[PDB]
């Protein structure tokens, strides 16, 4: 399995990569904000916590909670910011699953195509095995 | 031309920090024998 993550590894991280790097410059108002009180303002500080809280995202625990914890940022009509967010986590949390539990279930489709194509020769060897026994023993 | 400005931290502190493209007002307070008491709401100018 870990051979055949050759190429879907690289594009969830590039995915990841090209995401987090996007929404740093999004909420950027929720870290840089004179709001006193604020719980999840570090979340989006810094490259490495964009990282982490985009990957929280991607993990999809409490996102409900942390909509709301943005929300104490003044609602510019919801028109960019918020739907990118949602987008995001739906999309990536979705497809990046989807695509790994889709692949997994091929390989073992595919070890099981083999293992029945061996049995399936062994089968057929046995047979030719039996049928020449057949041949030889007329053949004394 | 090759102005300086020498900021004083006895008299001063730490200044208040804000970013580019932020419309902003400050907020001032009324202090009464050093107790917060009312906050201001009068016409009021700032300048350099």
Redesign the interface.
């Known amino acids: 399995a870990l051979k055949s993550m050759t190429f879907l590894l690289m594009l969830l991280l590039i995915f990841f990569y090209i995401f987090a790097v996007t929404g740093v410059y999004f909420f950027r108002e929720y870290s840089?904000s004179?709001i006193e009180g604020l719980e999840y303002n570090m979340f989006f500080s810094d490259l490495l916590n964009s990282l982490v809280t985009v990957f929280i995202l991607f993990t999809l625990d409490h996102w409900y909670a942390v909509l709301q914890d943005i929300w104490k940022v003044p609602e510019s009509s919801r028109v960019f910011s918020s739907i990118y967010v949602i987008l995001w986590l739906l999309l990536g949390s979705i497809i990046f699953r989807n695509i790994i539990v889709a692949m997994m279930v091929t390989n073992f489709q595919n070890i099981r195509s083999e293992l029945s194509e061996e049995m399936s020769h062994l089968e057929v060897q046995y047979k030719a095995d039996m049928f020449k026994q057949q041949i030889i023993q007329r053949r004394q | 031309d090759d102005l300086i400005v020498f900021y004083e931290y006895k008299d001063l502190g730490c200044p208040r920090?804000v970013?580019y493209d932020k419309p902003w007002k400050p907020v001032v307070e009324l202090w009464k024998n050093g107790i917060v008491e009312e906050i201001m709401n009068a016409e009021y100018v700032i300048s350099e």
């Open positions: 840089r004179t | 920090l970013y």
